């Protein structure tokens, strides 16, 4: 779901105010800026050496992670550059002393540095309002597959 071209749209895609000097003869790939979101969260090497842009990247973009940290399960990875996470919980009805299974759908913005798919449990972090509904940035794909790490059977 990611275009091969590093910039695909009409506007140019650059990290604002990080400049690579063309007159210089170092001729490294580019000058890519990055940061660590803290909380003992490892920045992915796919973001470290990657070539995407993703204005709203917790690791490379301007957005900062602060506030709530929510763990959930991916219910929809199939809309562009964003994720829909199913968070399940038990509401405690006290008149019966009984619990009640309930679910909420939290939109978030997964960076291209992560490879997500339906069913992955994801640790996500609070940030600024990114869109009308997304307020969280995907920070870790804990379960990449879960039960699909081993697929084939060849003794």
């Amino acid at each position: 779901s990611t275009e091969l071209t590093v910039q695909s749209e009409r506007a140019f895609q650059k990290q604002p105010h990080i400049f690579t000097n063309p007159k210089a003869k170092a001729n490294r790939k580019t000058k890519r800026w990055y940061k660590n979101v803290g909380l003992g969260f490892k920045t992915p090497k796919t973001a470290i050496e990657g070539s995407y842009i993703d204005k709203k990247c917790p690791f490379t973009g301007l957005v900062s992670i602060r506030g709530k940290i929510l763990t959930g399960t991916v219910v929809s990875t199939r809309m562009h550059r964003t994720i829909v996470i199913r968070r399940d919980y038990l509401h405690y009805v006290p008149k019966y002393n009984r619990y009640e299974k309930r679910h909420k759908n939290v939109p978030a913005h997964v960076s291209p540095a992560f490879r997500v798919q339906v069913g992955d449990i994801v640790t996500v972090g609070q940030c600024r309002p990114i869109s009308k509904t997304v307020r969280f940035n995907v920070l870790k794909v804990a379960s990449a597959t879960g039960k699909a790490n081993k697929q084939f059977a060849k003794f």
């Binding site: 910039q7 506007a11 140019f12 650059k14 000097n21 063309p22 009308k132």
Partner: protein
């Protein structure tokens, strides 16, 4: 009267929210500046908490910066050639942020001449020794020399004339220019 609150929008689910708390003053939105070229005419607007804002409609000259050697000069904007949002602004010569314009480019030219003196487009001993110590490091790339011979520089504006009132930006240079000229050749 143009509100920017979220109440008039439908909910994430899609329900039509009922009207509530008729829109306030801390939620207002003002008219677009849709600036033009020529006969500088900046109108002050008194916004929230004082803080004079400046609408910069009809702006002709502004500061522009060169990143390679890092030098800024006041120069004239001469039309807009590309806009990443809407080509309608390009046809109407509406100047907003991130628009791509042409530059008279003379001030950069004789700054280069008094700085390196390579005679693009085709003394005291102190200046001669400065140039000798420079030792022709001014190996600036070929396309900028091409439009120097043409005489009009390709620049991308970076200031917001709608808010700041200025007309500041930077010249396209390096792969930047590359990208956009492809787009321009798409237009051509």
């Amino acid at each position: 009267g143009i509100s920017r609150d979220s109440r008039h929008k439908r909910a994430a689910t899609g329900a039509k929210r009922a009207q509530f708390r008729k829109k306030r003053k801390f939620e207002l939105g003002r008219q677009a500046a849709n600036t033009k070229i020529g006969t500088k005419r900046i109108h002050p607007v008194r916004t929230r908490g004082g803080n004079q804002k400046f609408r910069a409609l009809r702006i002709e000259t502004g500061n522009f910066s060169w990143a390679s050697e890092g030098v800024a000069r006041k120069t004239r904007i001469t039309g807009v050639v590309y806009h990443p949002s809407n080509n309608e602004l390009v046809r109407t010569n509406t100047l907003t942020k991130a628009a791509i314009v042409q530059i008279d480019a003379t001030p950069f030219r004789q700054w280069y001449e008094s700085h390196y003196g390579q005679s693009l487009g085709k003394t005291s001993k102190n200046t001669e020794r400065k140039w000798a110590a420079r030792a022709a490091e001014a190996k600036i790339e070929h396309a900028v020399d091409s439009q120097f011979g043409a005489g009009r520089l390709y620049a991308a504006i970076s200031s917001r004339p709608g808010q700041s009132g200025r007309c500041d930006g930077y010249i396209l240079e390096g792969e930047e220019l590359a990208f956009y000229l492809r787009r321009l050749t798409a237009k051509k």
